[PDB]
Design a protein around this ligand. Structure first.
Ligand SMILES: Nc1ncnc2c1ncn2[C@@H]1O[C@H](COP(=O)(O)OP(=O)(O)O)[C@@H](O)[C@H]1O
Ligand SMILES: Nc1ncnc2c1ncn2[C@@H]1O[C@H](COP(=O)(O)OP(=O)(O)O)[C@@H](O)[C@H]1O
Ligand SMILES: Nc1ncnc2c1ncn2[C@@H]1O[C@H](COP(=O)(O)OP(=O)(O)O)[C@@H](O)[C@H]1O
Lengths: 429, 430, 430
């Protein structure tokens, strides 16, 4: 059926034709039902220059072509229908647009009968509308993870959103209060990478929208509070044949196949550059200065290492037939992130990359001793690692170079800023 | 035969709170939609143990909290949610550091000797301002406020609502009182098998806190929340039953007690110091009014390792034939570790035919200065040392004891850096 | 022949400040009454080194700070007090981690080759509100404020007072300027033997801070105290003299320089990265305005490892025949470690006949994007790594280098936990 006919059936009065730009910003146009047919076929016009797409004011408008299978009637306002879209420029999918970049990598893998499936653990904070503190002043204890009281104190927003995911058929299965005061997580079933990526982009918008409707605010910022741990976006990954078999399932260590370990080998070999994409902000690189590893230290790995059922590494092996990449944070682009991961993975497969030795230790503690390689310490270094990484850069195409340019400009901006701390500690130098 | 998915459908349960109690008594829970409960009930809900008070490592596999379907409680103030108590499992086995698991281990040993602990709890709590700075009722001020009719009825709405919930839940509530301190209250219900009472105890605190907050108030089970007032006890009533339904404490001796009851009592006396660490488990548990002429609420807490008689002045009171009341525990006492440690002490007393000593039919707050009675530990650190040195208790509670002690010493080091306003005001001019 | 007790009597000195500079540039001092100075001058003033920035242990014997009687300065704003610079001694020997001692070691090596470093410092500073939140003069606002006559005279009282002090002290002050940033100032004086200039540098900062505060203001030598303004340089002028009084940098080559000057310059270029760590020693030292069209005060700091010519756009300027100006250092540069590290780099250049490369007679803020010039370290951690990897510098400064690096990494770990308002505002909606 066409979108126009569905608009009539479901009572949809407007569609949000939406695309994700290089910085993860949701760009959208609100079009009345009477216009969906024309837009569905010809796309909605946007001036790509006004988004983060590294285009020119003199370029022809991009046409964003809605994927009708992505359709989501806003559960809090069903008369509006959300669509994810592919940005086209001059008659071709635009390779700097993240969803397009992802579909390209997916296409290469599918051509080898390898279909990436993933699921995302999107931690977020519920905070005051002005952003200055968490939403619950009573959520204060040192180890608040899974706090029953605080969890239920936010039952209304959490349960409302969860029920929405049930109805949407995402298979939500748990809601938690996470490690930091004010921090939460709502998990749902993994799916085909494109499906999960669309849900991911929609989910952030749904959480922000519902929080705001309850007089609160949600943030997926990696390190919103100086005194608390950060928002991870830990990602679970597996590769499937079209016929429905999990290629990662095998008879090797921990129930993993050689394909799984070669994929993991790409993740390891490509970790430095991968960091730039999945920890994509200046803020992504801040850490509590704590010798005694906080309860939430696990939100982020420090070392290019794996694995085991061990939340202390860059890659965890939770179970047979999957890998968990713990590297990504809450700012990770829903499309660029799976795309860059897949590019690194496929390469590991094609080069039969060796992931090295599994470390069955606590990398936060007994891993000071080990000569494990360290992850990039800031945005600029991660970006340089990305540019120097030919497989990764070539994997993502022109998205990589445009991304790197935006991040360098953010870096320059950042370097003009003063922290209160440096003023306090240097004024009397 | 208890199928959670089917009950969710019958009763309109949209979410379950799969919950467990950690070593510090904190309620840890995950909110799972009904569509996920079958899987969770069989396999458990995963939690990173490191993130709770379980003395685990960041690198450990997640624990799996396996819900006890029999504990199910639809939240009376929000029936679409079903609360479940759970046993922490680690590496395919029950996790001995988890309080509910520690308790079940002791009960199993007792049950193997055909001895079944039943207890009831007197969970005093205060109703206070949301910011915690004062009691909830500024008109509750009189020097002797206990059982004040006015103040009690002024909080009729919160108390009656919670009591009605307990009626419907089948706990057999039978009385609600204003207790000894201004702002202090208590709601009693029927004793039951220890695990049943423990689960109810854990749920009860959550219910009182939740309902208070819905009414714009706050509840606290803190031992000594106000410097000018007496404290929250968790006085505990105890009896031991055969599988066939006989109360072993019932007998022909003094006050209607059997020698078994007296030997159990003997274990409580013998293990008192270490017991204090578990049932008075916070730095705050050791604060006391400095009054030369006693006080109305002095009874909230015993000072001496003594019993008994129908006398609220001792560590152990004999309220009636067939039971002992341990008056030691305070409101911070872990709902599971407390019955566990008490049972460990009492089983040892029975096994050794422990002698409880002389019953003192005197007022221990007065006449108990004279009597050469042994004093209870005066602070957290001394209690913790007595616990670590107590083989029966430490061994009885398993690894839970050592982890508990490590946590308490860390709290103690924290406490030792703090300054009271008093010491500043009285020492600044030294 | 310089007797402190006798001078105290002649000149009315009631107290001495026996002072030393630690690795972070902090002035450590003890206030001793005149009656004690003889003993202190011979034996030194005791300090617990652990309590200053000297990377020592609580268990170490106190260091003894032995005052250099020749450094004596009666505080011009309070002549009853006599300031003395001191060498830190530990276990009967000069302490190599102490900056003044580190500097004297390098000078001794240079002097052993009949090479005597003389330098002068351009110590920019801002005059600011006592609370540090803004510059001291709310009327100093114009986009190009450099040498503003109005704003300069509006602070005539503090500037003239300090200048007069420098006149009486014999430093040969010759000019006072409003510098490039609003609120920024500079007071120049004659170059001198390196140790003399270093002592004066240390005293000067203290004098400016002290006099500003007496006038209800505050002075700061912080590199980048205001986000909207350029920074405080400590541009340093350098020449090397024989004992007989000849300036070795003077010669017949380009711009009146000898091959010795060019080889010295070659060492500055070769050792630039590591040098950056010492003379730009704070996290704050690496902040910069983000302007596409340069700025009036852009010159406060070089971006590239290049020279030279009478050109304020490079890391090294050749102001005139017979000297080099290193523009690298900022206001946080340790008065002793900075000349020490510079001299270590320059002596190596002379020893290796280091090639400085091509002089660039261009505007490096503009035309220096094109030129394939090497960039200076972009942050503290990278500078520190370059320093640790620099054998000549690390070896030249001795244990002072390693301790310095340890301190800077610790500051860095501290910095990495901080959030700017900018990143919160631009990332909260990610
Ligand atoms: N084979 C798989 N491939 C990709 N993602 C998966 C796979 N299996 C599960 N996931 C997803 O991983 C995420 C985390 O699952 P979860 O069972 O909570 O992991 P764990 O309990 O081990 O931490 C969920 O979104 C889940 O659906
Ligand atoms: N045989 C028993 N064993 C354990 N607890 C009991 C027993 N009998 C009563 N209790 C419980 O003791 C608690 C207090 O009972 P209560 O009659 O109010 O004591 P009293 O009036 O003597 O002070 C209640 O929870 C009650 O159910
Ligand atoms: N031969 C020299 N060696 C070291 N420093 C010198 C030498 N000559 C002058 N200086 C010092 O350099 C600093 C700057 O001098 P100045 O004449 O104002 O430089 P310019 O005007 O070229 O920018 C002063 O402290 C000055 O005394």
């Amino acid at each position: 059926t066409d979108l126009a006919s569905i608009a009539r059936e479901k009572g949809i009065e407007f569609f949000l034709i939406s695309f994700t730009d290089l910085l993860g910003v949701q760009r959208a146009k609100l079009v009345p039902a009477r216009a969906i047919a024309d837009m569905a076929v010809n796309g909605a016009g946007f001036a790509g220059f006004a988004a983060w797409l590294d285009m020119s004011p003199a370029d022809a408008d991009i046409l964003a072509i809605p994927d009708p299978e992505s359709l989501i009637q806003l559960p809090w306002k069903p008369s509006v229908g959300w669509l994810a879209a592919d940005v086209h420029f001059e008659g071709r999918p635009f390779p700097k647009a993240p969803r397009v970049a992802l579909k390209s990598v997916l296409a290469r893998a599918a051509g080898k009968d390898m279909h990436l499936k993933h699921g995302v653990e999107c931690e977020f904070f519920l905070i005051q509308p002005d952003g200055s503190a968490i939403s619950d002043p009573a959520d204060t204890q040192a180890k608040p993870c899974y706090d029953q009281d605080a969890l239920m104190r936010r039952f209304d927003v959490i349960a409302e959103i969860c029920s929405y995911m049930v109805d949407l058929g995402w298979g939500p299965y748990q809601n938690d209060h996470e490690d930091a005061n004010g921090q939460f997580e709502m998990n749902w079933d993994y799916a085909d990478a494109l499906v999960t990526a669309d849900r991911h982009a929609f989910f952030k918008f749904m959480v922000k929208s519902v929080a705001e409707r309850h007089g609160l605010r949600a943030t997926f910022m990696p390190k919103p509070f100086a005194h608390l741990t950060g928002n991870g976006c830990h990602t679970h990954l597996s590769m499937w044949t079209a016929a429905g078999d999990n290629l990662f399932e095998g008879d090797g260590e921990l129930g993993l196949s050689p394909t799984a370990y070669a994929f993991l080998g790409g993740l390891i070999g490509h970790a430095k550059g991968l960091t730039a994409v999945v920890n994509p902000t200046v803020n992504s690189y801040k850490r509590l200065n704590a010798p005694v590893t906080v309860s939430g230290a696990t939100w982020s790995p420090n070392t290019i290492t794996y694995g085991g059922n061990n939340r202390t590494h860059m890659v965890r092996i939770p179970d047979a037939g999957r890998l968990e990449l713990r590297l990504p944070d809450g700012a990770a682009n829903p499309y660029l992130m799976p795309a860059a991961i897949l590019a690194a993975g496929l390469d590991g497969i094609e080069t039969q990359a060796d992931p090295g030795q599994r470390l069955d230790i606590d990398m936060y503690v007994e891993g000071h001793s080990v000569e494990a390689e360290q992850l990039p310490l800031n945005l600029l270094d991660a970006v340089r690692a990305l540019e120097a990484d030919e497989v990764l850069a070539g994997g993502l195409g022109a998205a990589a170079a445009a991304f790197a340019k935006f991040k360098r400009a953010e870096w320059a901006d950042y370097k003009s800023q003063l922290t209160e701390w440096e003023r306090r500690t240097t004024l009397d130098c």
